PDB file of C-alpha atoms in Angstrom:
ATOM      1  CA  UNK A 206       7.002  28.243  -7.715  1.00  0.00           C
ATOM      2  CA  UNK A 207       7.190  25.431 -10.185  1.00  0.00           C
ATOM      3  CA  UNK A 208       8.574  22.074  -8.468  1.00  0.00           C
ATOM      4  CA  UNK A 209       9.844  19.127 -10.394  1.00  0.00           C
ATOM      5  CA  UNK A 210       9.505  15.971 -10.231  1.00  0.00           C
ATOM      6  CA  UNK A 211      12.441  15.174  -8.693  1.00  0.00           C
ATOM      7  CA  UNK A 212      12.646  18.243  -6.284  1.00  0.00           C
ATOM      8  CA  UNK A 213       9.425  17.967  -4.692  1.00  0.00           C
ATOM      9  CA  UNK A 214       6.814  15.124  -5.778  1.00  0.00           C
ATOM     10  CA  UNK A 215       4.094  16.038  -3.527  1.00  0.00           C
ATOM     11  CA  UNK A 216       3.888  19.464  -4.735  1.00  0.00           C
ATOM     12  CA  UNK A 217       4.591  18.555  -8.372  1.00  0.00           C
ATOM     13  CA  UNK A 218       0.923  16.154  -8.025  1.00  0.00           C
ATOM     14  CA  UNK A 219      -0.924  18.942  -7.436  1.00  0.00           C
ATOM     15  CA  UNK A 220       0.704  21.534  -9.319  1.00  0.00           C
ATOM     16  CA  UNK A 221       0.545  19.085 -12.625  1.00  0.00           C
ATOM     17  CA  UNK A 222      -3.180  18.000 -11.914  1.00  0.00           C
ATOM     18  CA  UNK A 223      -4.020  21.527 -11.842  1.00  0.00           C
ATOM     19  CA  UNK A 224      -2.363  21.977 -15.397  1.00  0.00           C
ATOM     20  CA  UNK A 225      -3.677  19.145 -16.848  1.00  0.00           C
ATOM     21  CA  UNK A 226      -7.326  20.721 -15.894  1.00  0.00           C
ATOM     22  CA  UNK A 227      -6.122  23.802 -17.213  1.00  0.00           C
ATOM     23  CA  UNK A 228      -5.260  22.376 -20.566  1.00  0.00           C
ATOM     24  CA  UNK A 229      -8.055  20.554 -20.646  1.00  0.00           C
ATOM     25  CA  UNK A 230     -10.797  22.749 -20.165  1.00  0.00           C
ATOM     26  CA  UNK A 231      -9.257  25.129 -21.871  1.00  0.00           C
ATOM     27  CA  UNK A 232      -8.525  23.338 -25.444  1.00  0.00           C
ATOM     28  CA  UNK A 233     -11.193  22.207 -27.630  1.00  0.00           C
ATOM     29  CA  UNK A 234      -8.562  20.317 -29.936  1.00  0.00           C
ATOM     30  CA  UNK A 235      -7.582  17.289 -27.737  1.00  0.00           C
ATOM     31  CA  UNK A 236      -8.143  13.845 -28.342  1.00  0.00           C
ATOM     32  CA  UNK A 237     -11.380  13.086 -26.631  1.00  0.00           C
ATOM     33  CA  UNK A 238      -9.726   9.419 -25.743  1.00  0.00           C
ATOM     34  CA  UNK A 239      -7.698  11.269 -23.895  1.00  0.00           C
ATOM     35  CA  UNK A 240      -8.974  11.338 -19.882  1.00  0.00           C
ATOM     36  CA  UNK A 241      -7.056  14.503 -19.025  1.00  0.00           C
ATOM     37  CA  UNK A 242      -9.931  14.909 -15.644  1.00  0.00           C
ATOM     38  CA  UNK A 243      -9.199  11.055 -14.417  1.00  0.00           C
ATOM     39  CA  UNK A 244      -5.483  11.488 -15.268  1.00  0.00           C
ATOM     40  CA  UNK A 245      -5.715  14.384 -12.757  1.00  0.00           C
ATOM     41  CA  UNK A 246      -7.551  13.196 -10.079  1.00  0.00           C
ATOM     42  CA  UNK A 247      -5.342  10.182  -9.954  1.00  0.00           C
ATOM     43  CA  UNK A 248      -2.343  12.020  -9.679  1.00  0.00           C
ATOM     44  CA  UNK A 249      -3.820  14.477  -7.258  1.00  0.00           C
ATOM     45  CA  UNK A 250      -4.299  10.995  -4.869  1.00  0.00           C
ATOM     46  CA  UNK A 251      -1.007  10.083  -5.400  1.00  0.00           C
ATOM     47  CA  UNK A 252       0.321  12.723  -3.872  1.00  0.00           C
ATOM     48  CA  UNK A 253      -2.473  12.509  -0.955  1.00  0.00           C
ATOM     49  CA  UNK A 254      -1.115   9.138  -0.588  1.00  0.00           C
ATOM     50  CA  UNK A 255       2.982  10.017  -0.128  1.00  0.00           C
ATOM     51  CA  UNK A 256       1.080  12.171   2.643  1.00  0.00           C
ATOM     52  CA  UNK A 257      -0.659   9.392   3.654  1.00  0.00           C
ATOM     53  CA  UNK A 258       2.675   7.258   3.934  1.00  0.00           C
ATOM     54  CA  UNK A 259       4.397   9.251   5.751  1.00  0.00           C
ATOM     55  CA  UNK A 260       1.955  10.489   8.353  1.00  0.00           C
ATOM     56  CA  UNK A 261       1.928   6.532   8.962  1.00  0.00           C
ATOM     57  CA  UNK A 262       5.710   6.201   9.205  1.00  0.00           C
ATOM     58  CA  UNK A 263       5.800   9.000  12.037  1.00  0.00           C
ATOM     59  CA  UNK A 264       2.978   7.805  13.943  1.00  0.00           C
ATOM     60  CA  UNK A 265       4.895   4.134  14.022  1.00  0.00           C
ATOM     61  CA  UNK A 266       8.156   5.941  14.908  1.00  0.00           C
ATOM     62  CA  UNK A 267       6.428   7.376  17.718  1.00  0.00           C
ATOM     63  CA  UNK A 268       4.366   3.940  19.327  1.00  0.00           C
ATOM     64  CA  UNK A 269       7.747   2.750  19.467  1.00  0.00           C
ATOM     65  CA  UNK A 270       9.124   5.811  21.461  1.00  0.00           C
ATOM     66  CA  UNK A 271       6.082   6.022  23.541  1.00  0.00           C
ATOM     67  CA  UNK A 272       6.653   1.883  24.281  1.00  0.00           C
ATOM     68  CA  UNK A 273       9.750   2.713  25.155  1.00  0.00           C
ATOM     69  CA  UNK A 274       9.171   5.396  27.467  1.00  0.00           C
ATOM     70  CA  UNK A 275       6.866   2.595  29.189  1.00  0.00           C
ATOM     71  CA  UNK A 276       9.928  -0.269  29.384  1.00  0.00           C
ATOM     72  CA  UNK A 277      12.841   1.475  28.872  1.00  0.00           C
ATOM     73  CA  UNK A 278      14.712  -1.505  29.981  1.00  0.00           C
ATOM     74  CA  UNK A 279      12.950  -3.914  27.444  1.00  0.00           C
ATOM     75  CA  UNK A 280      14.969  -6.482  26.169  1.00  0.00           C
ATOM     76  CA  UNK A 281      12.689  -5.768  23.092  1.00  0.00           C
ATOM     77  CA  UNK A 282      14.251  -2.133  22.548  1.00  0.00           C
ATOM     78  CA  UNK A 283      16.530  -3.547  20.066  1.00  0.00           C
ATOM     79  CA  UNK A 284      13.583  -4.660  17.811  1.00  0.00           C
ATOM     80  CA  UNK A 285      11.994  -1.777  18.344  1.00  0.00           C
ATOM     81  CA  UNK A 286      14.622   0.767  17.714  1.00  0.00           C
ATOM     82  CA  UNK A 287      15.745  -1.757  14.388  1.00  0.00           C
ATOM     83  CA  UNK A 288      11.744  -0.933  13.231  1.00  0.00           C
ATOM     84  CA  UNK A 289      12.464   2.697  13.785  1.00  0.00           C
ATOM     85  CA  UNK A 290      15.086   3.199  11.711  1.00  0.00           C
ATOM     86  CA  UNK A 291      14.033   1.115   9.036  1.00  0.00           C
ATOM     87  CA  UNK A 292      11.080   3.079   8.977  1.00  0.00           C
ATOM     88  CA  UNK A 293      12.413   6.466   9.720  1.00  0.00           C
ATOM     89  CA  UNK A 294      14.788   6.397   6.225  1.00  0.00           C
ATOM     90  CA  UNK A 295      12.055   5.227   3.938  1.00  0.00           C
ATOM     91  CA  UNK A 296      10.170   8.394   6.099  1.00  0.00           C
ATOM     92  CA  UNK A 297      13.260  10.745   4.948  1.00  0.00           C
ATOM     93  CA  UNK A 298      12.723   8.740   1.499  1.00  0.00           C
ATOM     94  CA  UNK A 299       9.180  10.282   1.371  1.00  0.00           C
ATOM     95  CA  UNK A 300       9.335  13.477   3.078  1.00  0.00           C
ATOM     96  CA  UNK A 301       9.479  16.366   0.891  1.00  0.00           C
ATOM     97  CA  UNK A 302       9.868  20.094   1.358  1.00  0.00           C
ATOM     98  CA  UNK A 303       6.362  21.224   0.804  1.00  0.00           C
ATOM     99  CA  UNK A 304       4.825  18.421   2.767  1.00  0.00           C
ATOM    100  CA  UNK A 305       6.645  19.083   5.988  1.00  0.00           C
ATOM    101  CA  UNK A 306       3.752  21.834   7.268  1.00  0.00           C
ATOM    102  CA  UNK A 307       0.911  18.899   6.425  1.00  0.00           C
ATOM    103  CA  UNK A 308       2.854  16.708   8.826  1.00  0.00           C
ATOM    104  CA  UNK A 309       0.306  17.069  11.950  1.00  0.00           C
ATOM    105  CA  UNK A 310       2.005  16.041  15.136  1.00  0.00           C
ATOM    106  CA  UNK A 311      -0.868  17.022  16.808  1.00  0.00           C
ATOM    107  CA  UNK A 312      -3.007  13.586  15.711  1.00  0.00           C
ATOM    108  CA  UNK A 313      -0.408  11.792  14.845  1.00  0.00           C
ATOM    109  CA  UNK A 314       1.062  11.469  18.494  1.00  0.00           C
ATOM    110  CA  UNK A 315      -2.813  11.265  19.874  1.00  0.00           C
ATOM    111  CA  UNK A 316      -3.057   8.118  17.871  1.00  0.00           C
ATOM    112  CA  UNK A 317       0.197   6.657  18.823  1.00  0.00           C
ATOM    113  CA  UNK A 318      -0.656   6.957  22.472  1.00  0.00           C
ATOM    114  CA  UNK A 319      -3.343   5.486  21.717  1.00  0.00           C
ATOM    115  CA  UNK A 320      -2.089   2.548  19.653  1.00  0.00           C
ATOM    116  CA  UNK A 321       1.091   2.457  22.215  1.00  0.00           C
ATOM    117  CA  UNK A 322      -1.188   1.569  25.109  1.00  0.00           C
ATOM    118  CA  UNK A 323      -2.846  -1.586  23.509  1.00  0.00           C
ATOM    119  CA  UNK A 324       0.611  -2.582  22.074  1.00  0.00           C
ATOM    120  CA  UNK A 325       1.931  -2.301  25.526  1.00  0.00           C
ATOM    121  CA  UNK A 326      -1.581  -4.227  27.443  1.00  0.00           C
ATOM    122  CA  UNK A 327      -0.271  -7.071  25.280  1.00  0.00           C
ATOM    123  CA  UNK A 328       2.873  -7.252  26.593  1.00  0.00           C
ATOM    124  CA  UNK A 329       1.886  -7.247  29.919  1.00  0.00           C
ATOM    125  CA  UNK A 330       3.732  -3.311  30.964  1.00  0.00           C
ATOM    126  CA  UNK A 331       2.078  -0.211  32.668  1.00  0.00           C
ATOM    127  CA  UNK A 332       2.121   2.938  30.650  1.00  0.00           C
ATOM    128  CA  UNK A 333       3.677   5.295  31.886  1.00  0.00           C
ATOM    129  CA  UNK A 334       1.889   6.883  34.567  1.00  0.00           C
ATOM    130  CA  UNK A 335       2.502  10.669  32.812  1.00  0.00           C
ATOM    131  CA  UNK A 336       1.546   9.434  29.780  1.00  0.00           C
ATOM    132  CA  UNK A 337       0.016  12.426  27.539  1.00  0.00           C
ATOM    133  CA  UNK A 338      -2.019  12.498  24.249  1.00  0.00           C
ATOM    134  CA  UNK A 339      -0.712  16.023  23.585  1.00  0.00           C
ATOM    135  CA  UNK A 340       2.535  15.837  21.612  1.00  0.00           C
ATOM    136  CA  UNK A 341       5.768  16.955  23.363  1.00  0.00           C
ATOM    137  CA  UNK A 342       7.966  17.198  20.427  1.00  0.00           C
ATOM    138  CA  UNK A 343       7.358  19.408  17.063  1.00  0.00           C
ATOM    139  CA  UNK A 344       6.755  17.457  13.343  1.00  0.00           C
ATOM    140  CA  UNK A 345      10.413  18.644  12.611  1.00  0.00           C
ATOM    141  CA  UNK A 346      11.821  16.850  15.130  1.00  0.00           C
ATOM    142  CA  UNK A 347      10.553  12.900  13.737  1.00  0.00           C
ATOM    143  CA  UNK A 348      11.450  14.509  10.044  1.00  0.00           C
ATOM    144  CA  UNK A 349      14.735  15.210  11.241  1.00  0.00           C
ATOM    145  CA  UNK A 350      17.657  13.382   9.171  1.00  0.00           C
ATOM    146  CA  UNK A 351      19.564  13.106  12.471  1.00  0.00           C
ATOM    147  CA  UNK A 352      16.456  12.322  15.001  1.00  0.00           C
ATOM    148  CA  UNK A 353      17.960   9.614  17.199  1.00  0.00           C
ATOM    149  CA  UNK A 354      15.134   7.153  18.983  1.00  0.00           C
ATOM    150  CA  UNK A 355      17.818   6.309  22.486  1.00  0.00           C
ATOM    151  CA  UNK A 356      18.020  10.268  22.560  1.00  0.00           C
ATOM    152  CA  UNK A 357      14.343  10.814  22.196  1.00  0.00           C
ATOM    153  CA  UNK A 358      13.884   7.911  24.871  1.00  0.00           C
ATOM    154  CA  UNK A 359      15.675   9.870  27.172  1.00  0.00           C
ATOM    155  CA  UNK A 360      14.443  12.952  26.676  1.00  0.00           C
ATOM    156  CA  UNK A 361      10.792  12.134  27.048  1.00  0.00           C
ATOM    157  CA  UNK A 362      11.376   9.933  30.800  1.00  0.00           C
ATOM    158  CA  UNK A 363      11.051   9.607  33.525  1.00  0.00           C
TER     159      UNK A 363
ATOM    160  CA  UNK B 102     -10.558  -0.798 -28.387  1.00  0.00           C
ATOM    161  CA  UNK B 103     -10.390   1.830 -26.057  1.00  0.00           C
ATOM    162  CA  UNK B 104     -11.587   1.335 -22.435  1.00  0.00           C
ATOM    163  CA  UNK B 105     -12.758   4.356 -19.914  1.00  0.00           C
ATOM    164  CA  UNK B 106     -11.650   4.490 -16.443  1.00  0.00           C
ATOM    165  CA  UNK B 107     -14.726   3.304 -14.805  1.00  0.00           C
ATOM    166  CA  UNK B 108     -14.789   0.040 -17.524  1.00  0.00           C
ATOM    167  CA  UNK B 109     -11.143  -0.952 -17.651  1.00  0.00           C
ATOM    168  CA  UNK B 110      -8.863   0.705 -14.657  1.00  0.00           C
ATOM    169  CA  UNK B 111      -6.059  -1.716 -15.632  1.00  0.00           C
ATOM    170  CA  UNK B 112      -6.083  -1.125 -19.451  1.00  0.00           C
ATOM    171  CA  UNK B 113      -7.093   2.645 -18.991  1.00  0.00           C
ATOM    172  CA  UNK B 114      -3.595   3.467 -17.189  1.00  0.00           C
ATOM    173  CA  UNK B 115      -1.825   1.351 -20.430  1.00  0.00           C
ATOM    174  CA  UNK B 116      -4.097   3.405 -23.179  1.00  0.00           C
ATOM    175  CA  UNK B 117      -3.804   6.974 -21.182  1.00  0.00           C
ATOM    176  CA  UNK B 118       0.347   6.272 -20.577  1.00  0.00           C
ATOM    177  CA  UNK B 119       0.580   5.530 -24.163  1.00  0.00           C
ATOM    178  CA  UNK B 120      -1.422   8.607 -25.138  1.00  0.00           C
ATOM    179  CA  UNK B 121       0.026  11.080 -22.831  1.00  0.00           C
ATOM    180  CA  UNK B 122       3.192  10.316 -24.663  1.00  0.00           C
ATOM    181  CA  UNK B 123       1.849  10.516 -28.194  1.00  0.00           C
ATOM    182  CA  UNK B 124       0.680  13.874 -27.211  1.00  0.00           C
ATOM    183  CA  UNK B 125       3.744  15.386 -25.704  1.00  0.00           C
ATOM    184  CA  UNK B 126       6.078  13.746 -28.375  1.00  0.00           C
ATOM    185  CA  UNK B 127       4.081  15.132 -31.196  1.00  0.00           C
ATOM    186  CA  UNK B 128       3.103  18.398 -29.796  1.00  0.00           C
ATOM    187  CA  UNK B 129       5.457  21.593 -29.715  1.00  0.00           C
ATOM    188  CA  UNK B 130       3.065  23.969 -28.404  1.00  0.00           C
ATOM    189  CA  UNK B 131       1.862  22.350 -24.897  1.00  0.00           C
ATOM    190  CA  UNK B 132       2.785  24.383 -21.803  1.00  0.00           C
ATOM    191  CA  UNK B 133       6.851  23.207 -20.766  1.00  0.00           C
ATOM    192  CA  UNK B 134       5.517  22.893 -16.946  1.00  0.00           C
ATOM    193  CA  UNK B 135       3.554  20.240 -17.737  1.00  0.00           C
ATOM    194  CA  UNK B 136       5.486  16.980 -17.536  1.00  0.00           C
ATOM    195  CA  UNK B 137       3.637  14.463 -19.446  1.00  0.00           C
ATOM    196  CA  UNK B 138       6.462  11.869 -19.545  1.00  0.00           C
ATOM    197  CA  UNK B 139       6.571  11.640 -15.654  1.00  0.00           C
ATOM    198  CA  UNK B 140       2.606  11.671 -15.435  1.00  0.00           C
ATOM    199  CA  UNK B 141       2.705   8.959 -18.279  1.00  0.00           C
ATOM    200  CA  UNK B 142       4.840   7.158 -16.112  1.00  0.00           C
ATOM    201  CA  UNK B 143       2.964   7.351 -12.647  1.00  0.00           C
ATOM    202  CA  UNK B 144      -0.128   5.975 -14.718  1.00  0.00           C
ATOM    203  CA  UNK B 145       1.378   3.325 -16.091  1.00  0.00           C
ATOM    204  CA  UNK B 146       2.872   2.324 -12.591  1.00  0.00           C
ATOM    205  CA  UNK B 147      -0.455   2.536 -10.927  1.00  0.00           C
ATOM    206  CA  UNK B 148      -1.532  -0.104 -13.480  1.00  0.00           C
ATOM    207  CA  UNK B 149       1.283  -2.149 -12.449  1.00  0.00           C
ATOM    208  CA  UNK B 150       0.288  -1.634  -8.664  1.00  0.00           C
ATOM    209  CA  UNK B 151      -3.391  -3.027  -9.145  1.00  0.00           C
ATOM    210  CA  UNK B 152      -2.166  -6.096 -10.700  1.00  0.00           C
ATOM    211  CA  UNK B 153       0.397  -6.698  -8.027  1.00  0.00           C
ATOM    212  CA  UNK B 154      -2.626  -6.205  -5.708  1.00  0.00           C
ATOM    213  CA  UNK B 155      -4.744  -8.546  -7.640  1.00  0.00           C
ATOM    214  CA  UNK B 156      -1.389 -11.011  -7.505  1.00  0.00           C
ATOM    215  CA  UNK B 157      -1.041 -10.608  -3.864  1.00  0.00           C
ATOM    216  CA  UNK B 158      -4.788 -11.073  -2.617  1.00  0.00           C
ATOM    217  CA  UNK B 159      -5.208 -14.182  -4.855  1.00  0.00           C
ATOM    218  CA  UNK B 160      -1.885 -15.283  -3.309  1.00  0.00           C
ATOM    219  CA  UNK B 161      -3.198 -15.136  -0.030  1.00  0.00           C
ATOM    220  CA  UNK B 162      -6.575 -16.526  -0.390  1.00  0.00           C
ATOM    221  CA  UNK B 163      -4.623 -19.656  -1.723  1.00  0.00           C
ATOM    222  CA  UNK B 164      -2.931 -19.650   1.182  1.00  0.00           C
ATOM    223  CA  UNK B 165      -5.662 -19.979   3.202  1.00  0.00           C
ATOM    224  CA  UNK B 166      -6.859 -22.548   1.040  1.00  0.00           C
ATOM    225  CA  UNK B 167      -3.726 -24.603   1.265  1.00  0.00           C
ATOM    226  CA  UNK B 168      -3.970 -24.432   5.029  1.00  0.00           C
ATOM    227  CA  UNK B 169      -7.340 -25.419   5.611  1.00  0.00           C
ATOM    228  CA  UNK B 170      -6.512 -28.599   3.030  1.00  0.00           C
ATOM    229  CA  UNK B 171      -3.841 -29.659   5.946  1.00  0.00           C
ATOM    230  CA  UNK B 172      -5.841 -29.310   8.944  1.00  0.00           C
ATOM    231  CA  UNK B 173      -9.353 -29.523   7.584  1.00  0.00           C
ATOM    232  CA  UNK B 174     -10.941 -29.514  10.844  1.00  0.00           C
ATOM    233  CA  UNK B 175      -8.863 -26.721  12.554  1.00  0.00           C
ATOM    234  CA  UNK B 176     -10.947 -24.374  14.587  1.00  0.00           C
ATOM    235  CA  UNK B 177      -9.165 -21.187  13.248  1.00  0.00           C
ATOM    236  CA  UNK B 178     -10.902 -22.366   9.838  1.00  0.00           C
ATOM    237  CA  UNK B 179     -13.508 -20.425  10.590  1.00  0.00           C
ATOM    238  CA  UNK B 180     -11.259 -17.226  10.950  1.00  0.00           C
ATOM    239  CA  UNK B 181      -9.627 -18.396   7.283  1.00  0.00           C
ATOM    240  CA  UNK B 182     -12.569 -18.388   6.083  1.00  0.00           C
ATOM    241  CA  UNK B 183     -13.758 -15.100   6.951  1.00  0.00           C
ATOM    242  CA  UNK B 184      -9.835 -13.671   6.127  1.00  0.00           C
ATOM    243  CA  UNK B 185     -10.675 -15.059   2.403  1.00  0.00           C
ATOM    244  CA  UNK B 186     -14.283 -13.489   1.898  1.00  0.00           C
ATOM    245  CA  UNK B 187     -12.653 -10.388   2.624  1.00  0.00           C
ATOM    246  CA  UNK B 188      -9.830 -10.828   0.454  1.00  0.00           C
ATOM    247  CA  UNK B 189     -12.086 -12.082  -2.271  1.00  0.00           C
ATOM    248  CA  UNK B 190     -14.600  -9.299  -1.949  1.00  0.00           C
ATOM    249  CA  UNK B 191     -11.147  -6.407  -2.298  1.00  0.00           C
ATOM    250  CA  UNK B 192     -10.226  -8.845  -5.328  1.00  0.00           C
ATOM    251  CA  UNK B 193     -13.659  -8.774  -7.480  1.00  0.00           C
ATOM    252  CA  UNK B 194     -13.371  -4.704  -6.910  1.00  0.00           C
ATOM    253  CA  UNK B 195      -9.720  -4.971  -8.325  1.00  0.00           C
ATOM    254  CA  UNK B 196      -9.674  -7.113 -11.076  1.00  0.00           C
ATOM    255  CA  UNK B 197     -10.638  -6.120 -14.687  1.00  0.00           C
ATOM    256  CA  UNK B 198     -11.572  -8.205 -17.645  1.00  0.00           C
ATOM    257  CA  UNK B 199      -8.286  -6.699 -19.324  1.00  0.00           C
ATOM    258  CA  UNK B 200      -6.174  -8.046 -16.328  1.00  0.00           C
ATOM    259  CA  UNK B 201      -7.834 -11.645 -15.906  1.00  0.00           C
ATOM    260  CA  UNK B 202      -4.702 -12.598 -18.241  1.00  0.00           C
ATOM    261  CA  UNK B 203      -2.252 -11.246 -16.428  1.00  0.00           C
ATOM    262  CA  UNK B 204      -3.001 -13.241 -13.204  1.00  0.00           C
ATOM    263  CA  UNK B 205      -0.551 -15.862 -12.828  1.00  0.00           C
ATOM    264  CA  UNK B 206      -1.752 -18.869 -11.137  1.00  0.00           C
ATOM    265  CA  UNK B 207       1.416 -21.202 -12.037  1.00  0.00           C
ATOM    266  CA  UNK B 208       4.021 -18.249 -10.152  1.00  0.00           C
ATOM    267  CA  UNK B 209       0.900 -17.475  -7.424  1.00  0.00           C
ATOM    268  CA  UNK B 210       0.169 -20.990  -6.089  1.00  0.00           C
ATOM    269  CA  UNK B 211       4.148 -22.429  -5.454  1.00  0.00           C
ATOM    270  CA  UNK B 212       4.467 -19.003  -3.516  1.00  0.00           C
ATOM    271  CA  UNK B 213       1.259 -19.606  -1.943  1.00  0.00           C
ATOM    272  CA  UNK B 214       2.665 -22.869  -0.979  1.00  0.00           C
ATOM    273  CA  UNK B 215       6.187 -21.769   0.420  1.00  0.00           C
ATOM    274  CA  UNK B 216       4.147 -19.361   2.834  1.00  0.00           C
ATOM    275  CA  UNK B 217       1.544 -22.069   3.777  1.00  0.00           C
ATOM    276  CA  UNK B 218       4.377 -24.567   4.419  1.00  0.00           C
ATOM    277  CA  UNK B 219       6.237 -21.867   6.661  1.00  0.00           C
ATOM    278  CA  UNK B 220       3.009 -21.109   8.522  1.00  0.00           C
ATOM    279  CA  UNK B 221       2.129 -24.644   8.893  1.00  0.00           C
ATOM    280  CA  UNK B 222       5.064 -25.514  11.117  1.00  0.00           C
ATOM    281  CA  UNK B 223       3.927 -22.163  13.340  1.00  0.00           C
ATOM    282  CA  UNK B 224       0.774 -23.989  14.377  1.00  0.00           C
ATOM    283  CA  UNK B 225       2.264 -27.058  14.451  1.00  0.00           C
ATOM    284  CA  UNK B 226       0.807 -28.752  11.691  1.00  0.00           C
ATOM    285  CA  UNK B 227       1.893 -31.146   8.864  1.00  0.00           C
ATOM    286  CA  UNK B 228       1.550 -30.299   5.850  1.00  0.00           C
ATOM    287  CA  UNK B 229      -0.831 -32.098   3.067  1.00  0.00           C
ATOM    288  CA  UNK B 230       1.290 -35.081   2.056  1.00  0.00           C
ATOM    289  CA  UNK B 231       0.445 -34.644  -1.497  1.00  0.00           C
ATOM    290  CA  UNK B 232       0.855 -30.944  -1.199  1.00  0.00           C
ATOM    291  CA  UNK B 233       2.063 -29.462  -5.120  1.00  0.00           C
ATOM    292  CA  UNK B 234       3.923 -27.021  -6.133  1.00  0.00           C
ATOM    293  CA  UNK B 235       1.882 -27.375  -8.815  1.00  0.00           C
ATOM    294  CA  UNK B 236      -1.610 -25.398  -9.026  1.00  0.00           C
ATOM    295  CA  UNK B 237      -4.246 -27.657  -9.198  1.00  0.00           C
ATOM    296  CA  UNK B 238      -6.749 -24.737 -10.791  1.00  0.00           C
ATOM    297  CA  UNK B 239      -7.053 -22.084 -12.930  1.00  0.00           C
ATOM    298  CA  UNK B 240      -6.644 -18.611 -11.857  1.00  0.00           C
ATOM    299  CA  UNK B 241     -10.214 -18.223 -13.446  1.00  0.00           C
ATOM    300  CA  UNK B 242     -11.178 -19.939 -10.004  1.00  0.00           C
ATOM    301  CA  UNK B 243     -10.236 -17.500  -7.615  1.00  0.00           C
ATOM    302  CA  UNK B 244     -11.269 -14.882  -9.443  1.00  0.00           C
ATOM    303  CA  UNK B 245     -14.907 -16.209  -9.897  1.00  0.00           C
ATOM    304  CA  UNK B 246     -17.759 -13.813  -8.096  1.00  0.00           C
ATOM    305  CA  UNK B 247     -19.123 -17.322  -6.800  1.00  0.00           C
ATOM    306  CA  UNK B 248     -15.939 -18.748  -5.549  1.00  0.00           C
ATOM    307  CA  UNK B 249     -16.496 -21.089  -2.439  1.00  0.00           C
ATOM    308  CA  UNK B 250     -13.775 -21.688  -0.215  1.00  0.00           C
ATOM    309  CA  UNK B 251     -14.876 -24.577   1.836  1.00  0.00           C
ATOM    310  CA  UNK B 252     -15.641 -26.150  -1.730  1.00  0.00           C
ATOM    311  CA  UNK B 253     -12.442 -25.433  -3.181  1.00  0.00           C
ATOM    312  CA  UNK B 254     -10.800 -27.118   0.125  1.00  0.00           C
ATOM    313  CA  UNK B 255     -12.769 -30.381  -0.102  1.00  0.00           C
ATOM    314  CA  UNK B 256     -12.123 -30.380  -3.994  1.00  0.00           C
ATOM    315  CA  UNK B 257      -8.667 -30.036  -3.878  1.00  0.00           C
ATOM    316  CA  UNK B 258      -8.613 -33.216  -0.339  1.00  0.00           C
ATOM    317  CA  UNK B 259      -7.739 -35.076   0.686  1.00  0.00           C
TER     318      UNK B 259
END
């Protein structure tokens, strides 16, 4: 189904560099300073990119949970949940309907344990000792307009 | 004169916007799905995004510059140093001859200066007594393939 603009952007970049192929291999009438193949291939990156931005929002979102679950009494927590939310609206800013299923919480959470450990070396705090590299939580749940960081916390100790 | 993609990036995204719209304005028979106008406008802002990234990686190579004219003999020179070949490098694979015009040493250099200042009094050093506002070079400088830090800093002492 068509998307527009405004109603899905990630799924309008690669619906609209497909038709801009189409047209232009298909018409023999264009201008030829006209870079139809570039113009398509940049657009088609854009929209890898909004993946790319949000895939790096999550994965923050979550090194601050996982940090969290490691000093839940950190006088940091504050900052850290202040980060999250800053970056979890510019995530709900970004998120779009057909790029929910390319959201994989599978690496994403991998990485952030991964990330969350050195953060946490450097602040001198044990991970925690159950720490796991397989993700507890679903995508959906990070995506969420109403996900709550404190709640997550919780949920994910002791 | 018109400029391909791999020649001009910065004046290709102007020329291709501009034509995009020339085409869908004039045209009655394109396909209704294919939304020129908001492609035309993604290209042109992708224009606008390398030439902020120019801005910003000339910005910050001044910086670097500005600090190393204040403490001239600071160990973490070395680490400036190596912080502005990479900078420069990303900067001679963004810049274009189309957007050496565009780059603003006058606005560049006072920010440059406002961050140096405020980074300064992190390591505890004074600034340059004579420090300007003012840039004391062209932008022409920075973007130079044989740009020399350590020369610019003893230039620009003491």
């Amino acid at each position: 189904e068509h998307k527009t603009y405004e109603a899905d952007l990630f799924v309008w970049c690669q619906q609209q560099a497909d038709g801009l192929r189409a047209l232009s291999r298909s018409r023999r009438d264009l201008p030829d300073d006209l870079d139809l193949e570039h113009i398509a291939e940049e657009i088609e990156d854009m929209g890898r990119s909004e993946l790319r931005e949000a895939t790096s929002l999550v994965r923050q979102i979550c090194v601050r949970v996982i940090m969290a679950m490691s000093a839940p009494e950190a006088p940091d927590r504050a900052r850290w949940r202040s980060e999250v939310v800053s970056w979890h609206n510019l995530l709900l800013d970004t998120i779009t309907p057909g790029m929910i299923d390319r959201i994989d919480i599978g690496v994403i959470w991998r990485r952030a344990v991964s990330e969350a450990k050195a953060a946490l070396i450097e602040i001198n705090v044990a991970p925690q000792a159950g720490l796991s590299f397989q993700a507890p939580l679903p995508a959906d749940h990070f995506l969420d307009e109403d996900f709550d960081y404190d709640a997550t916390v919780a949920r994910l100790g002791p």
